[PDB]
Amino acid sequence: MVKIRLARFGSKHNPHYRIVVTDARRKRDGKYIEKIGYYDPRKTTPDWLKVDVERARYWLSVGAQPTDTARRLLRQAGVFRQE
Amino acid sequence: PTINQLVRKGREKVRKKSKVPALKGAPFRRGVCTVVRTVTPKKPNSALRKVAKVRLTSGYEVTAYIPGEGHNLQEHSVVLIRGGRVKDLPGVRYHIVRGVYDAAGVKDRKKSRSKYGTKKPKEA
Amino acid sequence: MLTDPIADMLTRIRNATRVYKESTDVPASRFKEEILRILAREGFIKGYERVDVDGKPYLRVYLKYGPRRQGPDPRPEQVIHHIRRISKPGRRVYVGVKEIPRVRRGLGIAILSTSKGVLTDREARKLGVGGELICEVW
Amino acid sequence: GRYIGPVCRLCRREGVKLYLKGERCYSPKCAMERRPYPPGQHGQKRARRPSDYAVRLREKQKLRRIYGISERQFRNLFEEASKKKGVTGSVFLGLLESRLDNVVYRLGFAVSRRQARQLVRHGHITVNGRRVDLPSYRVRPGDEIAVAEKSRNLELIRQNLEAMKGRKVGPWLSLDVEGMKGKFLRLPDREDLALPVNEQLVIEFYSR
Amino acid sequence: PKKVLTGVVVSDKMQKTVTVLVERQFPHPLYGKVIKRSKKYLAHDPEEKYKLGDVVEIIESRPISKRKRFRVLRLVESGRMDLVEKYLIRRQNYQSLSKRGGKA
Amino acid sequence: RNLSALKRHRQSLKRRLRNKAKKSAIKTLSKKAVQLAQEGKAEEALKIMRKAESLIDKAAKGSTLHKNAAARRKSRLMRKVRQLLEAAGAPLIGGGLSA
RNA sequence: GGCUAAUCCCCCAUGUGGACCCGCCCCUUGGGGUGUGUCCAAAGGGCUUUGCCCGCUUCCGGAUGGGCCCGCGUCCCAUCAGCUAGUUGGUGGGGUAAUGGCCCACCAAGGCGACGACGGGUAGCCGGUCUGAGAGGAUGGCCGGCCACAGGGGCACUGAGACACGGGCCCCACUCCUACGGGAGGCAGCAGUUAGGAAUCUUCCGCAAUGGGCGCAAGCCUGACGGAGCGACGCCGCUUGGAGGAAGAAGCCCUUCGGGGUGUAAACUCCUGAACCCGGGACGAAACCCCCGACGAGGGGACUGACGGUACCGGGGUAAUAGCGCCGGCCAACUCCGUGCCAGCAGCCGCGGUAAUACGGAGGGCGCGAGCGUUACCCGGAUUCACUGGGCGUAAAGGGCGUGUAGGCGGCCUGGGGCGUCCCAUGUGAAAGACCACGGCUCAACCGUGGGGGAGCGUGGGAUACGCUCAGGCUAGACG
RNA sequence: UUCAAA
C-alpha cells in the first residue's frame, strides 16, 4: 500500500518536507519511489510549496493514498479541482 | 620487470611495523610497576636515567621512561604509558604520562608545564 | 626475428639522425609507409623514396636537420629531437577520441592508428575517432 | 576575540607603519615613528638574512595584522578564494575588503578597524536597513551601509563623520555624509589598493 | 537479454550434458596489456547431440541442476579438436607442479 | 509480563489443528484413489478421485493449501489415476477426466 | 464435565469467473486459446432507513514489495597443491509461490584446480569519507541502500509474508523464585546498572509537528520521532573593550653603568555597553472533525505547541575570563643566572665533563588563541613496489649452465569475419554527497531549490588502420 | 683506555 507523504529534510528547528510516493512500510526519511513536490512549513521563501500536479494526479490514479497533511497540501495546489 | 611479469607477478605492498606494540595502538595504556631502577645511557652519554618495568593491561611487561626531574614511584604504583622512544637507553620505547594516577607531576615546574602534568601556579 | 617492426623504424630513424646521415633505409611495410606519410607531411623528414636494396623492398628515408651553430659544437639542431614508440606488443595502448594526448602544447604530433586510417592526433580529433596510439614525435 | 593587546608594537615588527590606531598612527608618534627596529631587548641588533620561509611568514602576518583578523578566519577566506574563479591573489584581497568591519572603516564611520569592529558588534550599523553585529558579514555590491537611526546622534559618530566632509574615498566606495549612508559600489581590484604587501608571497605561504 | 556466450565442448562424458569452455579477451585494469581469461560452463545437451570439439553458442537458461544454468543454443563450427588440445594439455600440465615434481 | 499476543499462539494451535486435519484427509483419499486405479477398478477409482479433487480445491478455499499448491496436488492426482488405469481401464465414471 | 454467539468452522446451491486431466490450435522452456469430463464462491454489521455507508466472495489488470537465476567486479598466506561422494550429471519422485542434488530412491562416472582449487588467516558489502597533481592509497562510525544475527545450537507452527529481537518447542551454559517434585528469564529497543577500557551521555519533556498500527469516526498505542540535558569531541559565529595618552612611572630584567628593554603597555581622560534587569513575545498549525454543497470539487468555522515564556524585538545598563606550545639546525623567534657527562633534554642530526642561544628558572621574543600541546592511527611528501613512475658491471639485485613444457611475444602481401580497438544513438548511473547558481536563518556553519557533468555495464546502428581468427600467396627470419 | 675538542 503506497502512500503520498512527507519526508523531513530540514534541520533542527528548520523543517522542510518532500511530498513523495512510497510504500508505507519504509522509514519516514528513507528511499522513495518518486518526489512530486516539496512543502516548507514556515514560508521562509516566497515559494514555500510547489507540487508536480501531473505526477500526483497519477499516483492517485493507482493507489498512492495521501496522508492527511499530504492531502491538504496536494489540495491547496489544485490536485483535486475538477472544473 | 616486463609488463607480462607484473600481470603475472604484480607489485608487492609494504606493511608498516608499529614502533609501539603496547597494544591496540590505543593512544595510552595503563599498567602497574614492578621494578623501578635507574639505567646508564648509550654512548656517548652518561647519567642515571629513571625507568620502570610496567605490567600493562594489554598483558605485556615493558620498561617505560619517567620524564621530569623527580618522581614518587614505588613498587605497585599504577601509571599511564604513552609511547616515545628514549634515544639513549635502548629497550625503552614508551613514556610514563605524569600527573596521572600514582605518578604526581613534577614540582616547581614553570615552563612547559603542560607536559609533566603540573597545575598552573595560582600566581599571587 | 624482428620483434616489433615499427619500433624498429622509429629507431633506425632516431639513430641515423644522431650521426646526422643523409638518408637511411628500412624494410618495406605499407603500415610503415603510412607512418612516413605523416612524418613527411609534418616537416620531420624531407621525405621517403621506395628504393629496392639487394632486391628486397626498402624505404629510403631522407632526414632533415637544422642549420650549423655558434660556439663549441657547431652541430645542427635535430628536427626530430624525440620519437618514442607507445603502443608496443605486450602492452598495446588504445585511446578513445577524448583521450588523445596534446603532444607538448601542440608543437609535436602523435601518429595514431584509427579505423579511418592512420592519422595524426589533430587529424583524428578532427575526424573524431580513437585507436592504437602508435607513437609520439616532437 | 581578535587579538586585543599592544598594537603600535606589531607596527614595528613589520617595518611598515600599519596605521592600526588611526590617529596617532597617522601623526608623529606611531611608535614606528622613532623606533622602527623590532620590539624586545634585541630589536636594535643587526638582523640576519631572513630565510625564504621567514620572509613569506612576515609578508603574511603583515597582511593579516593590517585587517586584524585571526588565522582561523584568514585561512578560510584564502581557501575560499583559492577555490573561487580567477586570480586567487586579488580575489583574496577583494574579500578581506568585503568585510563589514572593514568597509565600515573604509567608509570612515570609524577611524581604525579595531574601532570599526566595536561599532558593528554593538549594533551601531545597518545594511540596507536592519541591524548587523557580524564584523565578518559579507558586504555584496550595491548594499548600503548606514548608521542606525537610534545612534546617528552619538558623541563619536559625529566627530568621525564631520571629519569626513571633503575627504574622498575609493573608486568603489561612495559616501553620503548627510544621513550617514554609504554604498558598496565595486569590489576593489588589486590596483585600487595601496597595500604595503606583496600578496604573491602569502599565496606561496599556504602553497607550502 | 539472456547472455549468450560462445565456446568449445571439452567434455561429453556426462549424460545429456557438455562442458563448454568460453574465452574472454580484455585490457588488464592496471597494466593495460590485454589478457585472455576463460571459464567453463556446464551446458544442457538434451539429445546428446553436440559432441566433443564442436563450437557452440551457450544461452542463459533456467536452472537445470546445481551448477548448470545454460542450454546449448546452436552449433557455429564443428569438431575443431585443436582447441580442446590447448585445454587437455594444460590440465595434463598440472600433473607436475606437485610434491615430487613431474614431467615436461 | 503477559502480552495478549498469546491469543495468537493460542490461535495458531487451533488453526494448526484444523489444517493438519483437512490435509490428512486429502492425502488419505488421494492414496486411496490411486490404490484402486492401480487395480483397474475404474468405478470408484474416479468417484474417490473426484471426491478428492473437491477436498483439495476446498482446502484451498481458505488458508490451508492455497493456489498452485492445490493445482499441483490435483494435477499429480489426475495424472497418476489416468495412466494407472492403463490396464484395461476405460474411465467408466468419467469423473474428473476428459475421456 | 456441562451450556453458548458471531464477520468462527462446515454441507448443499447459483457461478461472472477460476482450478485439473486429455485432445487440438497459436505461440515457443511451464505463454494464450479452444472442445468434451471434473472441481471451487461468500460473511455480515451501521445507520441521517426498500437507500446509502463500512465490510464479504470469484476473476482480470494496475501499483508497491519480495523469491530465485545469470555475466562481470570484490583481502592476505603457495612455508596451504592437489580437492571432491550429494561429490558431478541422469531418470523418476517429494517439497515450494517457483527453478534447482533443495531432499529421497535408483543409475552413470563425473565435477574443481597454477586464469590459484582445497586448507588457513582477516573482514559485514556499498553510496560515499579522508588523502593525492593524477594514477593510486587508506577507510565504510553518523546519514541512505543491501545483508546477517537477537545468550549458544537445532526445529517447525500460524500466516499474504517469518522459520519470527520484546511469539512457540527442545538441547547446552547462566540468573532468580521452589514446599526441592518443579517453575520463570533473555536491553545487540530508550534510558540506566555493573564489568572490561585510555574512552563514549539523562533511569530526562512531549505526541504539538512528520511517520507508522487499528478504527466509519472520535480516538487509542508509538523511547519511530520532534525537543531538551551532559561532553571544547568537531564545525561556524562572538566577547574578554574602543579612542586618547611620557623622549617615555614604578617593578622586573639586561649594561661597554652613557644607556637599552617590557611599553602606548599601564596609570589616567572621554566613549560604546558582554553580563544582568523591565516590558512585549512567535514561526513551526492546519488539516482530521463539524456545518453548506453531493460523504465530490468548492466555501465556512472550531480544537491543537513539547520546545518555551525560549528564540527574537523594544527600553534600561556595569569595563566586563586567557591560556598553551615553542625560540641549536631543519624551523618563525636571544640573553642573564643556576648547573658541571650530574640534574635533565631529545621528532631526526644531537646537547650537559666550570662562561651551555639545546638542561632548570627569569626577562624578552615567535606561533596560535577558548583553546594549545602530547600520544595513537590513515594519506602525503616517498618515482621508497615506480601502471602513470624505479632498477640489477663495481651500491641491494642476472638464475652455476643448458634442454625444452605451459605461457608471453611474431616478418612481407591479398581477401572474408568484426573478438580486442574506435564512433553515434539510447537505457541505467536512486536519495544524500562533491561541483555551479540562486535563496532561508542578521553572517557563517547548517539548510532549501534548480542545474551540469561522470567511470562502468545493457541495447540498436556503424568503421576495419592496428591486434585477433579463418582462407590463400611470398622468401628477407629459421631449418635443410 | 673513554668522550670530546681544531
Ligand SMILES: CN[C@@H]1[C@@H](O[C@H]2O[C@H](CO)[C@@H](N)[C@H](O)[C@H]2O)O[C@H]2C[C@@H](N)[C@@H](O[C@H]3[C@H](O)[C@@H](O)[C@H](N)C[C@@H]3N)O[C@@H]2[C@@H]1O
Ligand atoms: C540553558 N541551557 C544551555 C543552553 O541555553 C541556550 O539554548 C537553549 C536550548 O533549549 C535555550 N532554551 C536557552 O534559552 C539558550 O540560552 O546553551 C547551551 C550551549 C552549549 N554550548 C553548552 O554550554 C556549556 C558548555 O558546553 C560547557 O563547556 C560550559 N562549562 C558551560 C556552558 N553552559 O550548554 C548550554 C546549555 O544547554
Ligand SMILES: [K+]
Ligand atoms: K592431479
Ligand SMILES: [K+]
Ligand atoms: K472445559
Ligand SMILES: [K+]
Ligand atoms: K490483483
Ligand SMILES: [K+]
Ligand atoms: K525481481
Ligand SMILES: [K+]
Ligand atoms: K531430479
Ligand SMILES: [K+]
Ligand atoms: K573496503
Ligand SMILES: [K+]
Ligand atoms: K658556575
Ligand SMILES: [K+]
Ligand atoms: K634554557
Ligand SMILES: [K+]
Ligand atoms: K607515510
Ligand SMILES: [K+]
Ligand atoms: K649470484
Ligand SMILES: [K+]
Ligand atoms: K642451482
Ligand SMILES: [Mg+2]
Ligand atoms: Mg601503547
Ligand SMILES: [Mg+2]
Ligand atoms: Mg654527551
Ligand SMILES: [Mg+2]
Ligand atoms: Mg615517537
Ligand SMILES: [Mg+2]
Ligand atoms: Mg627519440
